[PDB]
């Protein structure tokens, strides 16, 4: 009665912790260590195995096969932890070349947020009207800008979209000579009470330095955004590995349960 | 004499450390590891158990049941540690969907600060006057703004409450044409000593860039505030788990004490 | 000859490391783990004890009592480590209510810097003149401001002391109409070369935003100062616990030494 | 059947983790610990060896030689981990004197990005035209500035290249007296509507302080860049050590496989 | 053949790692733990010793003395690690009073950079001319300012040297009334085109707030500089301890080698 419980509780707990390690968010600070830490908890347990199946007295290959399979599984998990952490730095050494895994990471992120399976993708409010049709705004295979949206598309084309209307307004809109809203129509005599349009050119340099420091801060902001994106990609890969290993763990448990009468 | 002490001191110390781990604040840096670290301290101790109850010589299911229960308890604690840490990042992968646990976290935070049990909620200075009544300022089921307070309500409606009087003063107050306090009454001839009301439009752009960098800093401030809120939620969940497991640990100790004569 | 040395060196080293852990500064990042790490170093050592005093072959309660006492001491130390770390975050959950331990922490900090024992408090340069007397500047039981000093009192009453002379100069000093030092005496005709006293009101808004960002930075400065104060309080509590446990460790060592002939 | 598997799976897993540790990016926070952590996982395993080859009962030098070789390999790896981490701080104590390893690190970084082996260096689009020739812009043995490029050469000569045309425009270009583009040709009567060219000298001091704080921020930016360069150098050295130890591990595995029939 | 190798390789590896731990830079984050981590690697190894020299079967004081010496050495190293880390925070509790170890740390830093031994101090380019003589600029026993240099002396006397010529130019230089270089000679009629010398006093307040935030940033810069100095001092003390323990380790190895025939 105590043998089965003492052999099942620790193994089941270790198998559950192995999955919980990946279920944890992308904590690059501790993950790389946590994945190994759990492994240590198994090594000590291996000693107890020597009591029930010594390496020179008892010959029980049945449970030894399952133990070796679990050891290989945890080793592969610890190894893939390093590959996952690799996506957090992207050192210049190379390896995981960019422009290849980004399309897969974006697809995974879109499938996690917007479910794709028939349970929620097909069974949902839909119609055959223009609300689900496609046009020049959807089919952008020719490198067309995205539609105007507040999720990072309206201000994107403006700020990040260099050479656009916000920075290069070459299209003749007629505001410089047709409208007077904050734009005098070819008014060359508009003087600031007898002075030029600018009180002191030093203000221009002050504004330039202010914009320079603002861009310096935006550089760190973009670095933090890239770090967050790398963390999200690592978490997505961890979730994928968890989903993949879930089936293997379930199969191993089913085999150990169905093969228990053969040994016990 | 030495057997009972040697079997009680380590188990009691481990049971106390298991609770102290949750009693620790929400230290995401070490908590995720600490919860596992303590577990290691038990694994080695398990070896000592093999001396008193070998897995193939002695059959003592009485204490084995309690040992397995303690192992399952610590495993569940380590597993819930990961669920708690999950509330610290809220990755885009999903899982703990927001807008559901926030109402429970706020309720727990309000109950911890403002006690709700009869010991302090009912036995306190109270009266049947307007000080405890309700009005349009308390019953805000129609999405009404909170009362004016300095705890994050007076400046909230002003700054975060867009489209309000601070940004969209559409209500005709009469200050633009009835009062002269920092608001000339339709005075179109008010010139800055012969110059327009503004010395140089470049100052407007300088102020705009200053406000832009101020908003950039406020973004990081809000990120830090959200991180602190997530840490507080994790600490609240840890305290809840501690309170829940306290009864289980007390019951286990009472059972081990009352069942000691059966084994010893 | 080897038995006594092998039993004394590890125990003495562990007892010294237990105290050195608290002697370490308030390193919240590693302390919480360090206190537990040392504990692990003892668990393995316990295995060696099983060789000299098996749990079912040898009955030696003499040294077993001291071993259990040391185990309880290290467990209490590890437990108090969590209480110490609790003073580093002060989560909204409650527990260590403020306004109670602050007066004790300040007293401990003043006693550590300014020694209070007769060895250095009484034996020091002193006299019965006004240098050691008290007046309205020392007896501030009526919530009086502290004396003017550069240790955080001169600028404190100025900046942090709202409603004072620096922000609300209600006392009629006579500088607005009696002195002309940076204060024209009721000079309403003082114009900036024909212009108002201010060139552009936009400069006022620029200065206001500059002061706003300065206050935003001062907020983080105050947060860091509070964190440093919490770290100092944790270090003070650690030093107090070290001083308390020093006597217990000395008594345990004296007992083990005087009781050695009984066992050895 | 179980003996060979139980002796091969753990050893192979440890050998793979030893290489994966170096395959991990330059994580100075955990690397220094990770390299040692894996070592611990071997120590416990050594205990199991005592079951198959006790230190006083069985004499099997064949596998003992391979075990000692693996132990020495992991020890050398752990030792070189410290030398790698040394490149992350470069303390004033000395040791790894600069100006010597920089030329090797740059060469390694250029070889990793731009492959040098014949597989990709020689087999690639090339021609005997000027596209592959050399001139005064390529042969810069006389300390000549690099060609103008956007990879850190166009703005480098401008900002970091003190005493240049951007800061010391001594070459007579003729813009001060030949061109009027933002440079009045010796126009001494150009007044800002009756005022000097500058409205207020205080703006000059404001711009000077703005540039001072910008340089203060650039100092931290350069510190972060140097830290990133040190991390990249550490990662390059780790990859080099990995490539070096790969051949040794392969040779050890081949020897253990070919020498298995002698022992088994 | 296997006994000697199995007893020498682990001990030698541990002795080398003990020194490599100190050879590592002053990593306060991991050092405090690393020093203890290595210790754990020894505890497990101690178990193996019980196989060759049980605590109740074999009496071998020869190697037991060396084992106890190594244990005491590693314990003293771990203890001194805490004293080294103490120099990283300098808590208000006291202990290592400043103004005493600073002169020793500076001397050690100067001896490490500028070698003092005859191998490099005496054997170097030197002469008996004024290049090696002393004058009022070298003998500064009367608290004289250091010579003008770019290593932190030219700008030091200017910025940090309050009450100097940069802030208190009391010496009558004659520039206020003798030179017109950015200093009108008692020109009271110099008006900014009919306006006072300053366009708007608000610019003075803006510059004052800019300087205030610059000083706030300089405060954090000085804090980081002090932290770096403390880290350098800790690294210097670690190197000193390494050099001290090198002789002890060499003596222990020589003794173990010369005393091997007595035991083996």
Swiss-Prot record, chains A, B, C, D, E:
Residues 30-37 are annotated as: Essential for TMEM35A/NACHO-mediated proper subunit assembly and trafficking to cell membrane. Expressed in neuronal cells. Expressed in macrophages (at protein level). It comes from the Eukaryota. It is found in: Postsynaptic cell membrane; Cell membrane. The keyword Transport applies. GO terms for biological process: acetylcholine receptor signaling pathway; calcium ion transport; chemical synaptic transmission; cognition; dendrite arborization; dendritic spine organization; excitatory postsynaptic potential; intracellular calcium ion homeostasis. It catalyses: Ca(2+)(in) = Ca(2+)(out); K(+)(in) = K(+)(out); Na(+)(in) = Na(+)(out); choline(out) = choline(in). Keywords: Cell membrane, Disulfide bond, Glycoprotein, Ion channel, Ion transport, Ligand-gated ion channel, Membrane, Postsynaptic cell membrane, Receptor, Signal, Synapse, Transmembrane, Transmembrane helix, Transport. GO terms for cellular component: acetylcholine-gated channel complex; cation channel complex; dendrite; endoplasmic reticulum membrane; membrane; neuron projection; neurotransmitter receptor complex; plasma membrane. The chain crosses the membrane at residues 4-24, 29-49, 62-85, 237-259. Activated by a myriad of ligands such as acetylcholine, cytisine, nicotine, choline and epibatidine. Oligomeric amyloid-beta protein 42 activates specifially CHRNA7:CHRNB2 nAchRs. Activity is modulated by positive allosteric modulators (PAMs), such as flavonoids, with a wide range of chemical diversity, pharmacological sensitivity and efficacy. AChR activity is inhibited by the antagonists alpha-conotoxons RgIA, ImI and ImII, small disulfide-constrained peptides from cone snails. Alpha-conotoxin PnIC selectively inhibits CHRNA7:CHRNB2 over CHRNA7 homopentamer. It is a multi-pass membrane protein. GO terms for molecular function: acetylcholine binding; acetylcholine receptor activity; acetylcholine-gated monoatomic cation-selective channel activity; amyloid-beta binding; calcium channel activity; chloride channel regulator activity; monoatomic ion channel activity; protein homodimerization activity. The keyword Transmembrane applies. Residues 86-236 are cytoplasmic. Homopentamer. Can also form heteropentamers with CHRNB2, mainly found in basal forebrain cholinergic neurons. Interacts with RIC3; which is required for proper folding and assembly. Interacts with LYPD6. Interacts with CANX. Component of neuronal acetylcholine receptors (nAChRs) that function as pentameric, ligand-gated cation channels with high calcium permeability among other activities. nAChRs are excitatory neurotrasnmitter receptors formed by a collection of nAChR subunits known to mediate synaptic transmission in the nervous system and the neuromuscular junction. Each nAchR subunit confers differential attributes to channel properties, including activation, deactivation and desensitization kinetics, pH sensitivity, cation permeability, and binding to allosteric modulators. Belongs to the ligand-gated ion channel (TC 1.A.9) family. Acetylcholine receptor (TC 1.A.9.1) subfamily. Alpha-7/CHRNA7 sub-subfamily. This is Neuronal acetylcholine receptor subunit alpha-7. It comes from Homo sapiens (Human).
